[PDB]
Structure 1
Amino acid sequence: EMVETVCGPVPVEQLGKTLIHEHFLFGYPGFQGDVTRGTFREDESLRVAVEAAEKMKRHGIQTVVDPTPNDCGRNPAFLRRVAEETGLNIICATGYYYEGEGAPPYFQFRRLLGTAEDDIYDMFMAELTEGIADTGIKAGVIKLASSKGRITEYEKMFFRAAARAQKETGAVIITHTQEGTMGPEQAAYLLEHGADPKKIVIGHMCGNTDPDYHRKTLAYGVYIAFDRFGIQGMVGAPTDEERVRTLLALLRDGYEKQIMLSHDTVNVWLGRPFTLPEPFAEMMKNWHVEHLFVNIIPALKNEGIRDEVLEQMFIGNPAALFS
């Protein structure tokens, strides 16, 4: 009945239209070391994040899940300023990123000491049930992430701790899959450890363009997310045209009660600014929070997808996920 947002508990029935995966802030681990040339400018960053929230609201979005990992610059107090300013519900995560682009040395060291997995569970419980740091904000989701072609020994500690914490709390799990791999394996591994499929979203499933891989994942009874619309050419991503093709195949198969959509935007980058060289910059030009509404949903309706199906994905599914 309630879910924890950065402004406290909100009834699940009031979440309304939701984007299941976007970042207001994000940095690659190591951004902290480039603080001199890459300082976090609070005022300007807040203006940018607020403008992003305002754009989302213009398209009827009432709730965003921001699954920024703990080791990637997660800042709940900043998210609260955005929500307090805009009235958008923002739900944040507890979790670490995958080994390949995360910051594994700290918990790798605790693994060597023999405490890491219990420590991770302790962290999850604290952040889900007590609060993050001194912010008073509880996470509403656990974020998990795996590597390309395998769930590493490091990552599996977090998967196990997540299943444990979920059993205790009923918290939703949101995942990252890398380059269209491990969707089935993530679902299997979590359910093998007692997690509830109706509380799991296997993420970045748009990264794979073979609909049998999606069907295999969907057979576990989990949610999947096509959550990187607008990301093309980069991080091994297929095109939006390929995402749409794959998505249409599944909707025409009747899977709409298991699918959610999003962009995985990064609205403010932590660390030093950068510009993408061509041709990448042109390929990435639609990576923004209005793209689903301006471009993708019209293309879906232009291929016969009806409003009730879209509403199932954006409103119905988040309501069920968090219930």
Structure 2
Amino acid sequence: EMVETVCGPVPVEQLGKTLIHEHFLFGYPGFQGDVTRGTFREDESLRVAVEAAEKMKRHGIQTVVDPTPNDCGRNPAFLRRVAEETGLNIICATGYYYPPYFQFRRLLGTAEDDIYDMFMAELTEGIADTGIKAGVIKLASSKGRITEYEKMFFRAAARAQKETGAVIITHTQEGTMGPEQAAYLLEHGADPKKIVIGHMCGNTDPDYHRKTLAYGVYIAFDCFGIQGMVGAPTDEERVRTLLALLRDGYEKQIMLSHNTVNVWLGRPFTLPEPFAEMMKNWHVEHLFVNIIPALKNEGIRDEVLEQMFIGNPAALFS
């Protein structure tokens, strides 16, 4: 029926056309240490975010999932300000990026319990004093493995999902562990229809994807526009991969996004022109402007795309 957004509960029927994975703000853990050179300018950042939101509304986006983790600068009140200004629905996450705070607590024996308690509080009571609840649980695993640290979060996540029916969204590292993540969450009682395995576009072998899809989870091709960095494949390889699965009838299990960071937290930087040109398409219109057109030209039907941006999010949250 309902999903919690940064502006409170909203009917799932009303979510409409949705990007499953975008960041208004994001910083890599440790950004907070770099405050003297990386101080947060709220009014300018709000301007950039409101601009990004409007752009999305231009292409009929009514809802955005912003899964920024707790230790990556998640800022619910700021997201609420963006939503209040634009009418955009924004759903935020509870979760951590892929030690030693939770490692210390593991020494105390309470760590996995504390993580569960955190998920429950943020899903059912509210984030800090913002009075905002998260709508998704955010998980991430490492390249080629789900570490013992990460598994605590996975187990906590599963446990929390059973109580709340919250959606789980995942991050996979460099195209690994898709099936392992799905299998492990299912072992601990999670519901596949409530799970999105993210960053699947980081692997070009459609066999890998089918292995993941066999579990009945959603997968996200959510890194469109990211090329030539962090061992990423090109958008063409993504399209090629995506086409294979669409033709094989998997549309009810696939969702698309860019994983943009519209305001970087911490110290400003400039990608060097080696990297810069390859990333030039990493913005929130790129799906609408460049990717979807190519898909049409390869005979993907509007009924199919609507399953991805409208039907799938709707089913996911219902």
Interval containing the TM-score (normalised by the shorter chain): over 0.9
- SS of the counterpart of 1:74? coil
Q: CA deviation at 1:170?
A: 0.3
Q: CA deviation at 1:232?
A: 0.1
Counterpart-to-counterpart distance in 2, 1:121 and 1:68: 18
- SS of the counterpart of 1:143? strand
Give per-residue Cα distances to partners, 1:41-100, cap 9 Å, x unaligned: 0000000000000000000000000000011110000000000000000000000011xx
Q: CA deviation at 1:243?
A: 0.2
Give per-residue Cα distances to partners, 1:264-306, cap 9 Å, x unaligned: 0000000011000021100000000000000000011111101
Counterpart-to-counterpart distance in 2, 1:6 and 1:13: 17
Q: CA deviation at 1:235?
A: 1.3
Counterpart-to-counterpart distance in 1, 2:297 and 2:227: 21
Partner of 2:13: 13
Give per-residue Cα distances to partners, 1:102-150, cap 9 Å, x unaligned: xx21001111110000000000000000000000000000000000000
- SS of the counterpart of 2:273? coil
Give per-residue Cα distances to partners, 1:24-46, cap 9 Å, x unaligned: 00001111111111110000000
Partner of 2:248: 253
Counterpart-to-counterpart distance in 2, 1:70 and 1:235: 22
Counterpart-to-counterpart distance in 2, 1:235 and 1:221: 28
Give per-residue Cα distances to partners, 1:167-202, cap 9 Å, x unaligned: 000000000000000000000000000000000000
Q: Which runs of 4+ in 1 moved over 3 A?
A: none
Counterpart-to-counterpart distance in 1, 2:202 and 2:104: 32
Counterpart-to-counterpart distance in 2, 1:182 and 1:278: 32
Residue of 298, 303, 307 corresponding to 2:298: 303
Structure 1: 5+ residue stretches without partners: 99-103
Q: CA deviation at 1:307?
A: 0.3
Q: CA deviation at 1:14?
A: 0.2
Partner of 1:154: 149
Residue of 222, 227, 230 corresponding to 1:227: 222
- Are residue 313 (structure 1) and residue 308 (structure 2) matched? yes
Counterpart-to-counterpart distance in 1, 2:124 and 2:104: 26
Q: How many residues in Structure 1 have an aligned counterpart in Structure 2? A: 318
Structure 2: 5+ residue stretches without partners: none
Counterpart-to-counterpart distance in 1, 2:184 and 2:273: 40
Counterpart-to-counterpart distance in 1, 2:143 and 2:155: 19
TM-score normalized by structure 2? 1.00
Q: CA RMSD in A?
A: 0.4
Counterpart-to-counterpart distance in 2, 1:238 and 1:109: 37
Counterpart-to-counterpart distance in 1, 2:299 and 2:274: 32
Counterpart-to-counterpart distance in 1, 2:278 and 2:68: 24
Counterpart-to-counterpart distance in 2, 1:23 and 1:295: 20
